[PDB]
Design a protein around this ligand. Sequence first.
Ligand SMILES: Cc1ccc(CS(N)(=O)=O)cc1F
Length: 435
Amino acid sequence: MLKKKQLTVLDLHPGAGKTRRVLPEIVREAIKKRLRTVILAPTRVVAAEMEEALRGLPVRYMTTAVNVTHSGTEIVDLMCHATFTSRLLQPIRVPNYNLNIMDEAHFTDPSSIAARGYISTRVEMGEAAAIFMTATPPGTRDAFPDSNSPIMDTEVEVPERAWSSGFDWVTDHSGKTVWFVPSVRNGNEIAACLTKAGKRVIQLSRKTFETEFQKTKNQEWDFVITTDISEMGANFKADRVIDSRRCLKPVILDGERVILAGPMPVTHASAAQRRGRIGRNPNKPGDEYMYGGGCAETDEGHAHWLEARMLLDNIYLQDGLIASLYRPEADKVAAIEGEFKLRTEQRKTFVELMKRGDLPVWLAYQVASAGITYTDRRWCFDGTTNNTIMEDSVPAEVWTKYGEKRVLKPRWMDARVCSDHAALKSFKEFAAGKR
Ligand SMILES: Cc1ccc(CS(N)(=O)=O)cc1F
């Protein structure tokens, strides 16, 4: 694996021990061969679990999620996928790592796709090696891979709303259930229904994941209600997955706006990762996978691949060259390599709108490419009437940094800034100049 110009896909089935058994072997070999190595974890939760798997090996944990005193001598770095892409974008020295290891390399967030495109391009240039660790590499067509113990797969109608009758099998279960929902809002409704039926429910989503995931260890629970974030190496002591088989797809319409289309079917990779949460204990056969729809390749035309091109266009590689997407996922977008390359000051604004602004990549790009500066929030209020953001079925209002009450009406509408109460809260704070 460790020879230059090599990219290896380590595609052992879910729970085969890629993280706890194979990764420490790779890291030991890399240290023996004096390869400057990066390990990319999808989440702070996984970074902390990797520290346990690698404990004693000289690894620099480039995250506050890990409480360790470093030697200062480590040649192996661990950081999040997003941190890798972030440091590449910023005026910060990123070592030209000899060996690039991506764990949960199926992750479809824009910064993960961008990281794969950067790494795979360095490998194609002959500059580096890489190992992509995932049961479900891009384009996989198998939603039912092998497991540590047999799984009972059942196609069944799964509720996506509160129910009064017709789903007794959901609440009649005496074990622990992980339930994949298409959105935070849909999980909120199902969670309230289960809570009303006497169930103990934990909800996970991207924004809440580190805090709330700890509750799955610290308290007794009957259901975890989660979005697709729990596809990225989140482990549960559960005996059932309920899978809507549905997700939201951000879609750019007419180059002008982003909508959250669907819900619609997940990919085969996503379905296999959702299922893969159970069947993991070779001593506990008969874990259950209840699935409520088919799979489809909904990654095609998904905004994350275009957003990944916006990130890669603004990462220095060599002179004017630009990193390509990882070949197996490169057809998911129709973009011209370099079309999103910004001049120095607009690139800095783009980065800050993502990093401090917490804006979606697409929206950060519209603002930065318009020549607007980071603190100039006039664009949050001067859009078309149809870009009016609603709160409780009336136009949302903020006090501008000038002290004027104004309707939230962004010049560019990205549905991700108001897809749930927390997102809208954060975007109101942005529009008000509060960060
Ligand atoms: C040991 C260590 C901790 C944190 C960071 C900051 S980062 N890379 O998360 O932006 C760097 C480090 F070198």
